[PDB]
Design a protein around this nucleic acid. Structure first.
Lengths: 247, 85, 106, 72, 61, 43
RNA sequence: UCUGAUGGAGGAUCGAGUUGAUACUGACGUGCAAAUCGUUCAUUUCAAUCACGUUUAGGGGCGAAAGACUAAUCGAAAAG
RNA sequence: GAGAACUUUGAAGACUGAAGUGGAGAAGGGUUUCUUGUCAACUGUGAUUGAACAAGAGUUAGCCGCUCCUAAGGGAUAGCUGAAAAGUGUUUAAAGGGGUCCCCGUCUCAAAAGGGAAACAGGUUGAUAUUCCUGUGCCAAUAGUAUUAUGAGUUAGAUGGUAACAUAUAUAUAAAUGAACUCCUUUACAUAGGCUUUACACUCGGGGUGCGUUUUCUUUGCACUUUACCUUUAUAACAAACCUUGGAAUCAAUUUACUUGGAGAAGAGGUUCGUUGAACUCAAUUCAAAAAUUUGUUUUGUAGCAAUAGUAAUUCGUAAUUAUCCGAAGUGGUAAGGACUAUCCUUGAAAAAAGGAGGGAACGGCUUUGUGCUUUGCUACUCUUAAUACUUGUAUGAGCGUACCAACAACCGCAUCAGGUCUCCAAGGUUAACAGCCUCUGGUUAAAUAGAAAAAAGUAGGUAAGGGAAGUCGGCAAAAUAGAUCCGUAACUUCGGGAAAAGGAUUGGCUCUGAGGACAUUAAUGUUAACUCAGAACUGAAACGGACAAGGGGAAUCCGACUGUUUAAUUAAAACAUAGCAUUGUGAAAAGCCACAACUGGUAUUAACACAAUGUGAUUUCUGCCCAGUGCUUUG
RNA sequence: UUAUCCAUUUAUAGGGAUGAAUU
């Protein structure tokens, strides 16, 4: 056989991200003494569209404290935040929508985004449009707090990790039915070369384990083990179950 | 006079796609193309610029909102809980 | 009718190669490349066009006189008059409120 | 090319040491109208005379140091 | 062609058997509407300027 | 084309110069000859 | 609710051009041509068309998937 | 000329028909270009021709391009791998610049369509022209000292307007102090729709000049009647934005459309930019009224360039003279600009380079004490342009391309091959039309041949009585209307469609009638413009979308929902894709999927509304039972 | 926590109570 499409993806030739018009990586402020023991307020000057993603980005201008001047940060905007608004980042920042706080300072039940799964990595979790995590518990001694992620998984992160208060905007995007193939074409034109798909069952056996035959069927179970090699992992990978969920 | 009985703005799609799909897209396009109340100036003139960005024609001020509406119930509820304290 | 041809080595209808016909004293219809229109200078705050300043491309702006590159008022040529007015009132009043807050603290 | 209207600036430019030639153009109009054109390093300065007497007097008062070019 | 244009001016080669484009292609309906609207608005402005109608009457009309 | 590099133009000139016949006074005692339409320079 | 205008949406329609290639299983088939010619046909606001530049190289690439294409060479190119 | 169907000239008949064998370029070619010879071979017939052969010649740039910038990206450095070859490219880098310690900082290449300092007209050759000549401009650069001269400012930095903002007009609007450190703007950006302005294009009428028709008619038909860059071109006008005043519901202003307003509308008066580029009495000038310099009235000038050039004419030795080059408009084709509206799960480059601002570091001159500072006595002094003189190495403008073809014989197809091959300009008539057909400018009358004859057969078309698919696997092929206006339009339907359903009528020419606008005078009277509809008589071998151009419809069944894509050269489909639906894995740098020999990497400028792996394939209605088998998976 | 590994940055302040802001 030959190398299958999934295997070709990792070579990164034509499958690199289409990022010509991206506005920059969305990262919150690098950890600083000001955020460790106080508040620093940045003024949001514009809310822009990053072509790759659905969530709007916010350009926030902070005034540097080490030297005279301003620094521009590209944060992922939470819903309801508006140009001309001052957002506070730090341990003593008030709990308000758009502010960046350590998750240990937030009470239980607050909705957060731009979660830092490890302290200081300036934003890793809960970043897609409309997503939010919930602070569902703080440790007795502090130093640790538990959140519920948009997938429903419970995660335990040290209390010093920062997050934005609120929900990342552009929520409900998935609700619109893409009516036609052209809209999907335009959607993936600015993301990747993952579209159109072409079913493996419509291929020839040389290029896909599903290909071949006189009737367009899989012919062998489509659930493959987690240890299957690269050209073999092609169906439902390491599936614990199949068919419709019932609850 | 009244031009289309029920399709409304989805008359642009003709007969293509399902009726259910067209009705679903109508429900959300109605609010995507609607004007909302700008709480900064009080004039109902904030329209969607991009998927999540809403700009007021008068203020020229833009806010981050929903994909198809200025606000979403989840964000509104979260702000309500925050502002309760 | 007289037909024309490009003269400036660029034979494609790009925006830097926009072209205009003209009748010469010799009775010939020739073609001249027009300069690209430059955007107006814009205010640093509201991003609106600031008046009193010409809208030349950088090469022409370098040759322009200083009189039509600036406005003789504070932030003139960089901030519009309305924004400057609002900035002045804001700067004065936000220090006035700080002073009254300090005097009312005790 | 620049047109100058007042007579003092024309005389001053002619007397200025950078001027080399004066161009005399005469032509019938309907009366013969003329124009005097000082050639300087930068520009050619034209003055238009409808007055035959004025355009007789002015180039005569012009100093003969600088050369003449009669076109017609 | 000048003689043909003169005949057309008298209205002599315009019958329905001489038309090949649609009604709108021959005489743009949008252009006709724009002309009518412009002449009516011009008349209303003239009347209001000369004060032969009241401001509210002008707005209603 | 009309647009050329200096080295390419010099090569064209040399190729033209090498396309002339043997002088008669020398013949009194050439196969490496080409036509522009038949054998292309390729260089 | 109904009527007349206005308005100008749409992977809307006809249709030259472009981009293709349905049929005549026409011509040709020692051709003009190692794929052309004629008529007919499809296509034209978009998943549209073109140019140059640039990336991906052989048990590899690339594939809206025909084992298609990768210099008249492909169920494993070409050169030695 | 030895020799002429295919060399040249004249005449005729025609063609190409501004979507051109017409002009310019790119790729590719490379001298095919030009002139003069010339015919051994080639130019599939001839050939005196030629892209053949031979000898000479021809390509002129500060302004056209490259060169510079950065993009997709390429190479290299540091490392790290690897026997190396090579692979990656900041992954423990002490890696040039600026001011005067500190700040910033991998290098280099990659666009002759992106960004970008600056040129026009006329003429000129056998062959080059924004390159030569003539004239007129523009851009960049111009070191040190000293003189002059130009301007400002000064007893260390100007002034007007309430404001929007404006002001330096010297030959030349050159100078309106300004350090470090900053913050912005320009460069700089998608698509669709109409509206509008301007230039060019086309066209109508008048005047002049020349030509043509003239059996007859014809105040006639045709041609010319031109005006570049540059001068912040000055102004004028207009879309907008802004300022002052004003203070809005009986809401008003206003667009084709909607747009806007107590966060300040209308009205009135202004400011600016942008369009354009002599518009407007624009400038100068003549005449009356305002005062110790304003408003009204005339002449000149294509505003300067500019007529000296160009064009079309009339003459004169054969190079010169003379006359014209000015009075009004319509259509909307192309291009650009403007102000808008709308669309996106699509938001539509960067840098070189340039500009503006915040800030306020430094501070006259002549002489003098002490150690750059306090000091004493006097004041007219600092920048900015230009020229000159001397020093400074020689104190303007580098190098490369520039001919020609661009297919029709100069390119690629083995060729002088009916193929292929990117871009710009785009006249008149008919017309919806850059369609078709015909025509003007330009080009051509050439095609590996001609003459004659003209049967069979072939090929590309026409037409056929009566019948009308009986033909054939199959209506294959052909035929049938087919434009426009008016009328009429079913089942079914996802209510959007079906639909041009089906199916009827009309259409020429001529003579008329009616309707649809703009401009001024003291409600009433004149001047003047588009083609667009509607109606009526008359007329003809009943014909009129007269050529050209131009749907066959209907009743159903199967498949695929649709737009789209595909086996380059036998399969275009019911195949692929698709939206929709469903399932699976993954909470992260000790993760999922994938690449790599290693190092390391892609997704990832990513983070579950995400990425990855599958199946099905719009909508509607549904999606039953089986975990025995084989897979997959969960606990110990 | 010293080997080793990971993340962030300009390696830019020891722990407790919508004007600018630099010499």
């Amino acid at each position: 056989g030959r190398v299958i499409r999934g295997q070709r993806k990792g070579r990164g030739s034509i499958f690199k991200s289409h990022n010509h018009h991206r506005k920059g990586a969305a990262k919150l402020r690098h950890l600083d003494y000001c955020e460790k023991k106080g508040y620093i307020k940045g003024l949001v000057k514009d809310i822009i569209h990053d072509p790759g993603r659905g969530a709007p980005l916010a350009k926030v201008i902070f005034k540097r404290t080490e030297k005279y001047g301003k620094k521009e940060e590209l944060i992922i905007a939470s819903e309801g935040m508006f140009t001309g608004q001052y957002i506070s980042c730090g341990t003593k920042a008030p709990l308000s929508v758009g502010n960046i706080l350590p998750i240990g300072k937030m009470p239980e039940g607050t909705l957060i985004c731009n979660l830092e799964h490890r302290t200081g990595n300036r934003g890793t979790l809960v970043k897609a449009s409309g997503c939010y995590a919930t602070v569902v518990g703080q440790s007795e001694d502090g130093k640790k707090t538990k959140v519920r992620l948009p997938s429903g998984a419970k995660k335990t992160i040290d209390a010093k990790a920062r997050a934005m208060v609120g929900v990342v905007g552009a929520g409900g995007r998935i609700d619109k039915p893409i009516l036609k193939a052209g809209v999907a074409h335009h959607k993936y034109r600015v993301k990747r070369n993952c579209w159109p798909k072409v079913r493996g069952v419509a291929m020839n056996p040389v290029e896909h384990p599903h290909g071949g035959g006189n009737h367009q069927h899989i012919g062998h179970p489509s659930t493959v083990s987690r240890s299957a090699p690269a050209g073999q992992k092609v169906g439902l990978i390491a599936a614990r179950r199949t068919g419709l969920l019932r609850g | 006079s009244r031009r289309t009985k029920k399709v409304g703005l989805t008359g642009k799609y003709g007969t293509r796609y399902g009726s259910s799909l067209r009705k679903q897209i109508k429900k959300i396009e109605l609010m995507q193309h609607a004007k909302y109340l700008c709480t900064f100036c009080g004039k109902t003139a904030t329209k969607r610029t991009c998927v999540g960005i809403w700009k007021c024609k008068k203020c020229k001020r833009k806010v981050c909102g929903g994909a198809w509406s200025l606000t979403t119930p989840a964000a509104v509820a979260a702000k309500s809980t925050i502002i309760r304290l | 009718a007289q037909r024309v041809h490009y003269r400036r080595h660029n034979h494609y209808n790009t925006k830097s190669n926009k072209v205009r016909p003209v009748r010469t004293p010799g009775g010939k219809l020739t073609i001249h490349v027009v300069k690209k229109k430059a955007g107006k200078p814009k205010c640093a705050d509201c991003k609106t066009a600031i008046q009193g300043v010409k809208a030349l491309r950088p090469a022409d702006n370098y040759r322009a006189r200083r009189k039509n590159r600036t406005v003789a008022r504070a932030y003139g040529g960089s901030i519009c008059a309305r924004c400057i007015r609002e900035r002045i009132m804001r700067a004065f009043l936000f220090e006035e409120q700080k002073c009254v807050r300090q005097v009312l603290k005790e | 090319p620049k047109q100058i209207t007042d007579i003092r600036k024309f005389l001053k430019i002619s007397r200025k040491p950078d001027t080399t030639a004066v161009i005399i153009m005469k032509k019938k109009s309907k009366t013969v109208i003329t124009k005097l054109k000082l050639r300087t390093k930068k520009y050619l300065y034209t003055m238009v005379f409808a007055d035959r007497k004025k355009a007789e007097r002015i180039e005569n008062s012009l100093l003969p140091s600088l050369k003449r070019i009669y076109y017609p | 062609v000048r003689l043909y244009k003169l005949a057309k001016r008298k209205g002599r080669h315009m019958g329905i058997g001489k038309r090949k484009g649609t009604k709108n292609a021959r005489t743009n309906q949008k252009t006709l509407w724009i002309k009518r609207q412009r002449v009516l608005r011009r008349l209303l402005k003239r009347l209001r300027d000369s004060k032969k109608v009241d401001r509210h009457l002008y707005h209603s009309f | 084309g009309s647009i050329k590099r200096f080295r390419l133009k010099q090569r064209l000139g040399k190729c033209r110069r090498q396309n002339r016949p043997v002088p008669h006074w020398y013949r009194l005692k050439n196969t490496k000859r080409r036509h522009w339409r038949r054998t292309k320079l390729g260089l």
